[PDB]
Design an enzyme around this catalytic site. Structure first.
Site, PDB file in Angstrom:
ATOM      1  N   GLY A 172      79.800 -20.863  44.706  1.00 59.01           N
ATOM      2  CA  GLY A 172      78.891 -20.969  43.558  1.00 59.01           C
ATOM      3  C   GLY A 172      77.858 -22.073  43.725  1.00 59.01           C
ATOM      4  N   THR A 230      88.639 -28.351  36.335  1.00 60.78           N
ATOM      5  CA  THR A 230      89.643 -27.734  37.192  1.00 60.78           C
ATOM      6  C   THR A 230      89.638 -28.452  38.535  1.00 60.78           C
ATOM      7  OG1 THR A 230      88.047 -26.038  37.871  1.00 60.78           O
ATOM      8  CG2 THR A 230      89.563 -25.486  36.071  1.00 60.78           C
ATOM      9  N   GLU A 248      58.197 -14.350  30.252  1.00 61.15           N
ATOM     10  CA  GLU A 248      57.759 -15.058  29.058  1.00 61.15           C
ATOM     11  C   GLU A 248      58.652 -16.246  28.767  1.00 61.15           C
ATOM     12  OE1 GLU A 248      56.709 -10.883  26.945  1.00 61.15           O
ATOM     13  OE2 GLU A 248      56.310 -12.604  25.642  1.00 61.15           O
TER      14      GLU A 248
HETATM   15  N1  LIG Z   1      83.601 -18.737  32.331  1.00 61.92           N
HETATM   16  C1  LIG Z   1      84.357 -18.534  33.435  1.00 61.92           C
HETATM   17  N2  LIG Z   1      84.480 -19.552  34.320  1.00 61.92           N
HETATM   18  C2  LIG Z   1      85.210 -19.404  35.446  1.00 61.92           C
HETATM   19  C3  LIG Z   1      85.877 -18.125  35.695  1.00 61.92           C
HETATM   20  N3  LIG Z   1      86.519 -18.262  36.860  1.00 61.92           N
HETATM   21  C4  LIG Z   1      86.288 -19.520  37.325  1.00 61.92           C
HETATM   22  N4  LIG Z   1      85.535 -20.207  36.457  1.00 61.92           N
HETATM   23  C5  LIG Z   1      85.018 -21.584  36.606  1.00 61.92           C
HETATM   24  O1  LIG Z   1      84.355 -21.717  37.868  1.00 61.92           O
HETATM   25  C6  LIG Z   1      84.664 -22.993  38.440  1.00 61.92           C
HETATM   26  C7  LIG Z   1      85.450 -22.815  39.717  1.00 61.92           C
HETATM   27  O2  LIG Z   1      84.605 -22.135  40.632  1.00 61.92           O
HETATM   28  P1  LIG Z   1      84.886 -20.691  41.259  1.00 61.92           P
HETATM   29  O3  LIG Z   1      83.764 -19.754  40.890  1.00 61.92           O
HETATM   30  O4  LIG Z   1      86.293 -20.212  40.992  1.00 61.92           O
HETATM   31  O5  LIG Z   1      84.841 -21.072  42.818  1.00 61.92           O
HETATM   32  P2  LIG Z   1      83.999 -20.257  43.910  1.00 61.92           P
HETATM   33  O6  LIG Z   1      82.551 -20.112  43.508  1.00 61.92           O
HETATM   34  O7  LIG Z   1      84.738 -18.951  44.093  1.00 61.92           O
HETATM   35  O8  LIG Z   1      84.047 -21.178  45.225  1.00 61.92           O
HETATM   36  P3  LIG Z   1      85.257 -21.189  46.293  1.00 61.92           P
HETATM   37  O9  LIG Z   1      86.443 -20.434  45.733  1.00 61.92           O
HETATM   38  O10 LIG Z   1      85.535 -22.662  46.494  1.00 61.92           O
HETATM   39  O11 LIG Z   1      84.680 -20.477  47.491  1.00 61.92           O
HETATM   40  C8  LIG Z   1      85.500 -23.724  37.413  1.00 61.92           C
HETATM   41  O12 LIG Z   1      84.634 -24.508  36.584  1.00 61.92           O
HETATM   42  C9  LIG Z   1      86.142 -22.607  36.634  1.00 61.92           C
HETATM   43  O13 LIG Z   1      86.515 -23.021  35.316  1.00 61.92           O
HETATM   44  C10 LIG Z   1      85.697 -17.061  34.689  1.00 61.92           C
HETATM   45  O14 LIG Z   1      86.228 -15.943  34.827  1.00 61.92           O
HETATM   46  N5  LIG Z   1      84.940 -17.329  33.619  1.00 61.92           N
END
Ligand SMILES: Nc1nc2c(ncn2[C@@H]2O[C@H](COP(=O)(O)OP(=O)(O)OP(=O)(O)O)[C@@H](O)[C@H]2O)c(=O)[nH]1
Ligand SMILES: Nc1nc2c(ncn2[C@@H]2O[C@H](COP(=O)(O)CP(=O)(O)OP(=O)(O)O)[C@@H](O)[C@H]2O)c(=O)[nH]1
Ligand SMILES: Nc1nc2c(ncn2[C@@H]2O[C@H](COP(=O)(O)CP(=O)(O)OP(=O)(O)O)[C@@H](O)[C@H]2O)c(=O)[nH]1
Ligand SMILES: Nc1nc2c(ncn2[C@@H]2O[C@H](COP(=O)(O)OP(=O)(O)OP(=O)(O)O)[C@@H](O)[C@H]2O)c(=O)[nH]1
Ligand SMILES: [Mg+2]
Ligand SMILES: [Mg+2]
Lengths: 131, 432, 429, 432, 429
Positions: free
Chosen positions: B137, B170, B245
Site C-alpha cells: 500500500g 496494527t 471538478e
Molecule cells: N478499512 C480497512 N482497513 C484495512 C483492511 N485490511 C487492512 N486494513 C488496514 O491496512 C493497514 C495494513 O496494511 P495492509 O493493506 O494489510 O498491508 P499491505 O498493503 O497488504 O502490505 P503488505 O502485506 O506488507 O505487503 C492497517 O492500517 C489495517 O488496519 C480492511 O479490510 N479495511
C-alpha cells in the site's frame, strides 16, 4: 478569561430602551437611534476590543455595512472573538441580522450584563479603532 | 464515454474493492457472473455477449487476498488478467514495495492499465485504493503513481487512502511507511481522501448500535462514500460534478491536497423510523465532529473548501437553505482568503442498499468532502512518531537492507516538516 | 424576416434552453415532433424568427447546443421535446472543463469552438435577414462562462452588425454554488462588457425567493425556476413574433435601455405571479400588473432597486388592453417614485404592447430595468475576487492552463472601472 | 406550529410522563406504535410515514425506570435517542445529581434537546417533570434548568414538581434536597406548579372511594391537570390561554412563582350520576380547601392570582356568574394590591377518559392554578426541618464527600429565609 | 365612492370581525364563496364600500386580519365564510403576546407591524376615495390592545386626513377576565385618546345582561354577543351603503357627536331586541323603538346614563318610516328627560334615516350616546391601575420588555386628566 451570564427573570436590573441606547452612544461615540442598528455587529465587535485588548481583527469589520452578508461577516468575527475568550452563550446570528427588534434587544441586554461583569474602567479613544 | 479506471492495491485496497464492486453490481443490476437481464458503462466494459467486466485492476504482492476473489462469489465478474499477484509480500516494508519486490510487477501492472485505457473513449482518470501502513500500500502504490504520472501526463488521479489512527494501530513500522509514501506520492497525486478505521468503528458503535464492527462493515461504509463521489458519472442528476471538478474546488494550493470524507445518515433499521431525515438534518450531521471519518477536531481548525454531494429525493432550494444556516454557525469557521466555501452536487438516485447490510434504506444521503487545516494535527503526530523511532534508528536496518538509503529518511522527514509549515502558513488570516 | 440564432452553453445554458424551447413551441403550436398542430394563422406568420422549416412540413429550432461534456446533451435528447432539435446542432466535447474558465475559454473550449462556429455560420446563411443572437449560460462555471464568452467573441467578430444578447446566470450573494465562481464570473464579465449589446442578469437566489414567497411553492424544482426565465425570454421577442398596438423589438429595446455602451446589464421581471389558491381572489388589470412589476421582491437579480436609481425601464405588455391606461400607469410610477429614477433622462419608461397574450393568461407583462443598483453585485464579486487573488488561492489551476496574473489583474481593474462608472451616473445631476 | 417540549427527570418525572403520554395518545387517537388511522402536532412530530413521535426526553441516572418504558406497551412510540439512562443513580443526593453523576450526561441531554428544538418552527417552551426529594429530581433538574436558561435565553419554562408532604415522607434527606434544588433553580424557572402526594391520596380516598390508591392513580390525576393546561394548545377553544400568559398572570413578583393546581370534578362511576355537575358546582369545588392538591390551608392565606381553565360543555356567561359569587364569599380573600384576581380560559374539548381509569366521564371539568401566600407555611416547615438536621450536621458528610461545600448549605438556607420574608412582606395590605 | 378599510387585531378582534363580515355579506347578498346571489340592485350599488371586486365576478372583503398567534386565524379560515377572505390579508406571528401590552406594542407586534402596514397601504391604494378605517379589538389583552394601538398610531400618521374608528371591548366592572387588564386598558386608552376620531365602548358584562334579561336567553354563547356588536357596526354605515330620507355617514356622526376632540368615547345601543315568545305580543313602531333605545338596560357599556348627562345622542333608523314621527319622538325624549341632557348644547339629538331595513325586520334603530357617565368606567380603571402600580405588582413583565415607570405614570396622569375633563362638562352651565 471571561465569565458567563444569563437573563431570564429579574427585577430592578433592566435598563430602559432609551437608557441602554444612551449607554451605547456614550461608550462607542456613535449616534444610533434604533436598537436594531446594533444588528450590523460592528458595535459588538468594538465593545469586545474595548473589553479585551487584542481579541478582534477590527480591520476586517465593516463599520458602514448595509447588506445582510456584510452583517453576517461581522458576526463571524464576533463569534470568533467569543470563542477566543471562552464565552459560551450562543449568538442567534440568523435572527439578529434580520434586524428584528426583539432579538436585538435581547442580545444587547445580555451583552450589557456581560460587559458590566468584565469591564475594568479603562479609557480609550474609539475613533482610532473605528478608523 | 466518461470511463473511470479503478486500481486496488494490497489487502486494504483489495478488500475495499470487493465491497465497492459488490455495490456497483447491485446498483446497475449486474449479476456476479457479469450478466444483466450507458450508465453502468463508465465502470463496466461490455463484451460481445451480455457480459460486463469491471474497468479495474487488483494488485497485491502476495496471492492470499486476491485468491479469495478468484475462488469467491465474483470469480466470473473479473477477467483473470486484471487480478495480479506476486509470490512474496512487501512485509510491511516500503522499500520492498517500492524497490525489491515491486520492481518485478510494476511493468506488468502498467501494461494491463494501458490495455484497459486503450478501450476507453473518454477516460476521466483513475481511482486508487490502498493503505498508508502496508509495504505494498505504501511502497508499491508510490511507485505505481509515479509511473502513471509519466505515462499519462495530465489525467485526474484520486487516492482513497486508509490513514493510520492516533492510538489504534496494527503495524509497528506504520509511521515510517506512512511518511515515506506521502513524501514520494505528494507531487504525483492530485487529491487524496483520508479515512480512519478508528473513526468508522466509532460511528458503527455509536450511530449503528453495533457492539463489534468488523472490517467488512468499514469496507461497506467506504463503498458508500465512493458511490456518492462516482454517482454523478454513473447516473443522471439535477446538478452534476465530475472528477476533474473536485480537484479544482477542494485543492487551494498544490501540496494541500488532503480533503476528508463524511457521510450522512448512517442509521439502523429501528432508528431509521422515528425521524424524517431532512436535508437540513443530514447537512447538520455532516458538520458535527462525531460523524467524521478521521479522528481529528475541525472545531480547532478552519475549513478551506467544502464539497457537498447530495443524492436521492433532494430539492436544490432546501440545500441552499441548509447551507446558509450552517454558514452562520460558530462551530463552522472558514479561512479568510475563501469567501465562497461550497461546491454542491445533487443527484437523483437514492443510495442503494446491499442485501444483509448494516445501513437502513433512506430517501436522501449526502457525502461531504472537506479540506481542513485540522489535518495538520495528524501530520504533526505522525512526524513526532517518526522522530521517536528514528532517533534510535529503530527498524532502520531492514529498510537499508532492501536497498534504501538513510538520507532518504531525513529527506522524507524534512519534506513533511515543510508540509506542516505550509499548512500553518495557510491557516493565518490576511493582514490589511 | 428578422431571424434569431439561439445558443446554449454548458449545463445551465442547456437546461434553460430546453425549457425556453418548450415554451416557444407551445406558443407557436409546435409539438415534440416538429409538426404544427396550432389553431391560428398568427402562430405561423412569424414562425421563421425561431424555426427553420424542414421538408415534409416540420419545424426545427434555430438552436445550437454546446458543452464540453456529453451528459447534459444526452439528457436533453431524452427529454420531452428533445427530438425536435437538429441532431447535427448538438456540438459536444468528451473531457469537461472542471469548473474552470480557462479550460472553457483557452483549452477544451478552443478545441471545440471551430465546430460550433461552422454550425453557426451555416445557420446565419440559412436566414434571409439575421436579427442577431441569444446565448444562455452561467457565469460561475467553466463551459457556459469560458466557452460561452469565447463564442461571443468570435461570433461578434464575424457578425459585428448583428445584436448579441445574453441571459446570464450570475453567482448568488449569500451562498456560493462553486468555490472558484468569483474567478469565473469576473473573467466572463470582462468579455461581456466589451462584446455583448445587452445582458440580462438572472440570479437563482432571487428565483427561489420568488418561488417561495410569491408563488407559495414550498418545494420548488429547478424546472420551476427555468420556467420563469423562459417566460421572460419569450416576453422580449413577443412583439417581433406577433402583431401589436405599439411594436417593439430587440434593437429598439437596446437603444432605449442603453444610454452608454458599457451600461447594458439589465434586471428582468415578470408579471403576473400568483399561487393556486390566491389567483381567484385578485383581478388581473393593467394597474395591478404595473404594481407587481415595480417592486424589489419581483426582480430576478439579487439587488434592491431602492438602493440605486433606474436609468431606464422597458415594460412589455401582452394581451388586449387599453394603451391610455398603460401610459397613465407609467406616468404614475414615475411621478410617485421620482427619487428612484435618474432626473437627467426624462420620461425614462419605454412601453411596448403585443396583442397576443401567453397561453392560460388573458394579460401579462415583462419588465426590463437598467438600475444603478446592479453595481452592488459587481462590487461583491470584486471583493470576493480580491480576497482570493491577494493570497493567490487556486491560481495554479488557471496558470497551469497558460493564463498569467496580468490577465487576471486587467480583468479585475476593468470590473472596478465599470463599478465606478455606474456609481458616477447614480450621483450625477 | 406552537410546539411544546416535555422533559421527564428521574423516577417521578418518568412515571408521570408515562401517564401523560398514555393520555395524549388516547386524546389524539395515536396508537402505542405511533400510528393513527395540526392539533396533535404541538406534542408529536411526524415522520414520512403515518408514524408520530412525542416531542419528549426521558432522563434518569439509573436504567430501571426507563427500561420499563423500553420493554413496555409504548416501546415503539418513543425514538431510542429520547430515552436517556446512565448506570448509577444519584442515591437521594443532590450533589451526585448536580455534580458527580449529572455532569456525565448533561451534555448528552442538552444535545438531544437541541435536536428536538431544531425541528420546531414555533417553540412555545418546556414542560419539566420531576420531584424535589430525589437526587436526580433535585440535583440533575437544577443543573439542566441552568443550562436551558443559558442556551435558550427567554423561552417559557414550566416545572411540575412533586413537593414533599408535611408528615408523609419517604426519604430522610428530602428536606436537604428540596431546599438546595429550590435555591439553585429559583432564578432559572418562570413558574413552578407544586403538587403533593398526600393530598392526592386523600382526594382518591375521600372523593373517589378508593381504599388504597396507588402511585399510578396519582399519576393519572396529575395527567389530567397537565392536559387541562395544554388543551388550549392541543385543541380549539372559545377563549384561549397559552404558556406565556400563565407566567404573566400567575407571577406578581419574580421570586413568587409557585402557584398550585386543583382539579374538579374527581368522581367515581356511581357518584357521577345523582348530581348534574354545573360550572357553579365545580368552581365551588375548586375553592373548597379539601379538594386542593397541596396539604395547606388557603383560609389562613390570601389569593394573589387565580387562573381558571374550563373544558368541555361550558358557557362563558355561566363561568362569569360563578366567579362573581365566589368573589363575594368570606373564605376567598385576595391581597389588597390585586383588584383583578382571575384569568379565565374556556376550551371546547371535554376531558377524555383513560380506559380502566378511576375517574368518571364528565361533560365539564376545570383546572384552577392559584398563587397563595399560604404556601409560605410549607416553606417555613421545610426550613425548620432543614434547621433541625443541619444543627447536628446530620448526613452532611455525604454531600461534602460528593464535592459540595458546607457554605453552600448556609447559602441555600439564607436564600430560603429571604424567600420566606418576601412572602410575608407581600402578604401585608397597603397603607393609605 | 367612500371606501372603508377593516382591521381586526387579536382573538376578540378577529371573532367579532368574522361575525361582522357574515352580517355584511348576508345584507349585500354575498355567499361564503364571494359570489353575488342577491335579488336587488340596491345590494350592489355601494358594494365597493366594504368589498373589492375580483376577477370572474366575485367580491372580497377589504379586511386585514392581524394576530401574534396563528390559532384564531386558523379557526376563522375554517369557519363559515372563512373562504371569502383574501389569503394574503391574514398577517400572523408565531409567538403570541402573553396577555402583555408591551409585547403587542413594542416587541412581537413591532416585528409584525410593517407587514400589516404594507397590506394596509395596498388596500388604501386600491380605493378611489378612502373614507377611513375601522379597527375591532379588546383593550384588556396584548395583541388587540398593544398591537392594535400601534397600528392606529402608524395608520394615522400615514393617513391623517382619514377618519379612524374603533370598536373596543373594554374590561368589565364586577369580574376581571385577566389579571393585568388594568395595565393593558390604561395604556391603550392613552393611545386612543390621541389617535382615534371615534371609539365605541363595548363591555361583555352589558352584553350578557342584555342576552339574559332582554333576549331571554338562559344560555348565551359568545356568538350571540358578537352578533349584537355586528348589528351595531352595520347600523353605523347603513346610510353610506343604501339610499335614505336623511342620509348620515361616519364623518357627520363624528362631527355631531364630538364637541371636543378628547371626548370621542361612545356607548352604543341597538333596537329592537325581543325574545322568541314575546315578539308577537308587541308592535314595532317608531315610538316603541325610541323608548327601547333610551334606557340603561339597553346600553352596551356598563355605566348608567342616569349617573351623568348626555352631551350628544345620534339615532340612526332603518326602514320605511315617517320622519315627522321620529322628530316628535326625539323632541319628546329631550323634553321629558331634560335633566339627563346637557343644557348648553341645544337640540343635542342627531337623526339619520336609511330606507333599507336589516333582514328579517321591517324596522330597526341604532343609538350612539356620548354620555358623561362613561367617566365612571375610566375612574374604575384608574383605581385598579393605582392599586397595582403603587406596589409595582407585575411590573417586571413590562419593564423586562424595555418599558419604564415614567411611561406608566404619564399614561395614568393622562387618563386622570380625561376623567377630570368629563367631570367638568357634566357640571358646566
Ligand atoms: N478499512 C480497512 N482497513 C484495512 C483492511 N485490511 C487492512 N486494513 C488496514 O491496512 C493497514 C495494513 O496494511 P495492509 O493493506 O494489510 O498491508 P499491505 O498493503 O497488504 O502490505 P503488505 O502485506 O506488507 O505487503 C492497517 O492500517 C489495517 O488496519 C480492511 O479490510 N479495511
Ligand atoms: N437556474 C438554473 N441554474 C443552474 C442550473 N444548473 C446549474 N445552475 C447554476 O449555474 C452555476 C453552475 O454552473 P454549471 O452547471 O452551468 C457549469 P457548466 O461547466 O456545466 O457550464 C450555478 O449557479 C448553478 O447553481 C439550472 O438548471 N437552472
Ligand atoms: N365579546 C367578546 N369578547 C371576547 C371574545 N374573546 C375574548 N374576549 C374578551 O377580550 C378580552 C381578552 O382578550 P383577547 O382574547 O382578545 C387577547 P388577544 O392577545 O388574543 O388579543 C376579554 O375581555 C375577553 O373576555 C369574543 O369572542 N367576544
Ligand atoms: N406522584 C408520584 N410521586 C412519586 C412517584 N414515584 C416517586 N415519587 C416521589 O418522588 C420522591 C422520590 O424521588 P424519586 O423520583 O424516586 O428519586 P429520583 O429522582 O429517581 O432520584 P434518585 O433515585 O435518588 O436518583 C418521593 O417523594 C416519592 O414519593 C410516582 O410515580 N408518582
Ligand atoms: Mg498484504
Ligand atoms: Mg430514582
Amino acid at each position: 478569561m471571561a465569565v458567563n451570564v444569563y437573563s431570564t427573570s429579574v427585577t430592578s436590573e433592566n435598563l430602559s430602551r432609551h437608557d441602554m441606547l444612551a449607554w451605547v452612544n456614550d461608550s462607542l461615540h456613535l449616534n444610533y437611534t434604533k436598537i436594531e442598528q446594533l444588528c450590523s455587529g460592528a458595535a459588538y465587535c468594538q465593545f469586545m476590543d474595548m473589553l479585551f485588548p487584542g481579541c478582534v481583527h477590527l480591520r476586517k469589520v465593516k463599520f458602514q455595512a448595509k447588506l445582510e452578508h456584510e452583517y453576517i461577516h461581522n458576526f463571524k468575527v464576533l463569534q470568533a472573538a467569543f470563542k477566543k475568550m471562552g464565552v459560551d452563550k450562543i449568538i442567534p446570528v440568523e435572527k439578529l441580522v434580520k434586524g428584528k427588534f426583539q432579538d436585538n434587544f435581547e442580545f444587547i441586554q445580555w451583552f450589557k450584563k456581560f460587559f458590566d461583569a468584565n469591564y475594568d474602567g479603562k479609557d480609550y479613544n474609539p475613533l482610532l479603532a473605528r478608523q | 464515454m466518461r470511463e473511470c479506471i479503478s486500481i486496488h492495491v494490497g489487502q486494504a485496497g483489495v478488500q475495499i474493492g470487493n465491497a465497492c464492486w459488490e455495490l456497483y453490481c447491485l446498483e446497475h443490476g449486474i449479476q456476479p457472473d457479469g450478466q444483466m437481464p450507458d450508465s453502468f458503462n463508465t465502470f463496466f466494459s461490455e463484451t460481445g455477449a451480455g457480459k460486463h467486466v469491471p474497468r479495474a485492476v487488483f494488485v497485491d504482492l502476495e496471492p492470499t487476498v486476491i485468491d479469495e476473489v478468484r475462488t469467491g462469489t465474483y470469480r466470473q465478474l473479473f477477467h483473470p488478467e486484471q487480478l495480479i499477484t506476486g509470490k512474496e509480500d512487501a512485509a510491511n516494508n516500503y522499500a520492498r514495495g517500492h524497490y525489491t519486490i515491486g520492481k518485478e510487477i510494476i511493468d506488468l501492472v502498467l501494461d494491463r492499465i494501458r490495455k484497459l485505457a486503450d478501450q476507453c473513449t473518454g477516460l476521466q482518470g483513475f481511482l486508487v485504493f490502498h493503505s498508508f501502513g502496508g509495504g505494498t500500500g505504501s511502497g508499491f502504490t508510490s511507485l505505481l503513481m509515479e509511473r502513471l504520472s509519466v505515462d499519462y501526463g495530465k489525467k485526474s488521479k484520486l487516492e482513497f487512502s486508509i490513514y493510520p489512527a492516533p492510538q489504534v494501530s496494527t503495524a509497528v513500522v506504520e509511521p515510517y511507511n506512512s511518511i515515506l509514501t506521502t513524501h514520494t506520492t505528494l507531487e504525483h497525486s492530485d487529491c487524496a481522501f483520508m479515512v480512519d478505521n478508528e473513526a468508522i468503528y466509532d460511528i458503527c458503535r455509536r450511530n449503528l448500535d453495533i457492539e463489534r464492527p468488523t472490517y467488512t462493515n468499514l469496507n461497506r461504509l467506504i463503498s458508500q462514500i465512493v458511490s456518492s463521489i462516482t454517482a454523478s458519472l454513473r447516473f443522471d442528476g439535477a446538478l452534476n460534478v465530475d472528477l476533474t471538478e473536485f480537484q479544482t474546488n477542494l485543492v487551494p494550493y498544490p501540496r494541500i491536497h488532503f480533503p476528508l470524507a463524511t457521510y450522512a445518515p448512517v442509521i439502523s433499521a429501528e432508528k431509521a423510523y422515528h425521524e424524517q431525515l431532512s436535508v437540513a438534518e443530514i447537512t447538520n450531521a455532516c458538520f458535527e465532529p462525531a460523524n467524521q471519518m478521521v479522528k481529528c477536531d475541525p472545531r480547532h481548525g478552519k475549513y478551506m473548501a467544502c464539497c457537498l454531494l447530495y443524492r436521492g429525493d433532494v430539492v436544490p432550494k432546501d440545500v441552499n437553505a441548509a447551507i446558509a444556516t450552517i454558514k452562520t454557525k460558530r462551530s463552522i469557521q472558514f479561512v479568510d482568503w475563501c469567501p465562497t466555501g461550497f461546491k454542491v452536487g445533487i443527484n437523483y438516485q437514492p443510495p442503494t442498499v446491499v442485501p444483509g447490510g448494516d445501513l437502513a434504506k433512506v430517501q436522501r444521503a449526502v457525502c461531504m468532502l472537506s479540506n481542513t487545516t485540522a489535518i495538520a494535527e495528524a501530520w504533526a503526530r505522525l512526524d513526532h512518531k517518526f522522530d521517536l523511532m528514528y532517533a534510535k534508528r529503530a527498524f532502520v536496518h531492514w529498510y537499508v537492507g532492501e536497498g534504501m538509503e538513510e538520507g532518504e529518511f531525513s529527506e522524507a522527514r524534512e519534506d513533511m516538516a515543510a508540509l506542516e509549515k505550509d499548512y500553518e502558513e495557510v491557516g493565518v488570516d490576511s493582514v490589511e | 424576416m428578422r431571424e434569431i440564432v439561439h445558443i446554449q452553453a454548458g449545463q445551465c445554458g442547456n437546461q434553460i434552453g430546453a425549457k425556453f424551447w418548450e415554451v416557444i413551441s407551445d406558443e407557436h403550436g409546435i409539438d415534440p415532433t416538429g409538426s404544427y398542430h396550432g389553431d391560428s394563422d398568427l402562430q405561423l406568420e412569424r414562425i421563421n424568427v425561431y424555426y427553420n422549416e424542414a421538408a415534409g412540413n416540420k419545424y426545427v429550432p434555430r438552436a445550437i447546443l454546446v458543452d464540453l461534456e456529453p451528459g447534459t446533451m444526452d439528457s436533453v435528447r431524452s427529454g420531452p421535446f428533445g427530438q425536435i432539435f437538429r441532431p447535427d446542432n448538438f456540438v459536444f466535447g468528451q473531457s469537461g472543463a472542471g469548473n474552470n474558465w480557462a479550460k472553457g475559454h483557452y483549452t477544451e473550449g478552443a478545441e471545440l469552438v471551430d465546430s460550433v462556429l461552422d454550425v453557426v455560420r451555416k445557420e446565419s446563411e440559412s436566414c434571409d435577414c439575421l436579427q442577431g443572437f441569444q446565448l444562455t449560460h452561467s457565469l460561475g462555471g467553466g463551459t457556459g462562462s469560458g466557452m460561452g464568452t469565447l463564442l461571443i467573441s468570435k461570433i461578434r467578430e464575424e457578425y459585428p452588425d448583428r445584436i448579441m444578447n445574453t441571459f446570464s446566470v450570475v453567482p448568488s450573494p449569500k451562498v456560493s454554488d462553486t468555490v472558484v465562481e468569483p474567478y469565473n464570473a469576473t473573467l466572463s464579465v470582462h468579455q461581456l462588457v466589451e462584446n455583448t449589446d445587452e445582458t440580462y442578469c438572472i440570479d437563482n437566489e432571487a428565483l427561489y425567493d420568488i418561488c417561495f414567497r410569491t408563488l407559495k411553492l414550498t418545494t420548488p424544482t429547478y424546472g420551476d425556476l427555468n420556467h420563469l426565465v423562459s417566460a421572460t425570454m419569450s416576453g422580449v421577442t413577443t412583439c417581433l413574433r406577433f402583431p401589436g398596438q405599439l411594436n417593439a423589438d430587440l434593437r429598439k429595446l437596446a437603444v432605449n435601455m442603453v444610454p452608454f455602451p458599457r451600461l447594458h446589464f439589465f434586471m428582468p421581471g415578470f408579471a403576473p405571479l400568483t399561487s393556486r389558491g390566491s389567483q381567484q381572489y385578485r383581478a388581473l388589470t393593467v394597474p395591478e400588473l404595473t404594481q407587481q412589476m415595480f417592486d424589489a421582491k419581483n426582480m430576478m437579480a439579487a439587488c434592491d432597486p431602492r438602493h440605486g436609481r433606474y436609468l431606464t425601464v422597458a415594460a412589455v405588455f401582452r394581451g388586449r388592453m387599453s394603451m391610455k391606461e398603460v401610459d397613465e400607469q407609467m406616468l404614475n410610477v414615475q411621478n410617485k417614485n421620482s427619487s428612484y429614477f435618474v432626473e437627467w433622462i426624462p420620461n425614462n419608461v419605454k412601453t411596448a404592447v403585443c396583442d397576443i397574450p401567453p397561453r392560460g393568461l388573458k394579460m401579462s407583462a415583462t419588465f426590463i430595468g437598467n438600475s444603478t443598483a446592479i453595481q452592488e453585485l459587481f462590487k461583491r464579486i470584486s471583493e470576493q475576487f480580491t480576497a482570493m487573488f491577494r493570497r493567490k488561492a487556486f491560481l495554479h489551476w488557471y496558470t497551469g492552463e497558460g493564463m498569467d496574473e496580468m490577465e487576471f489583474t486587467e480583468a479585475e481593474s476593468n470590473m472596478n472601472d465599470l463599478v465606478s462608472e455606474y456609481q458616477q451616473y447614480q450621483d450625477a445631476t
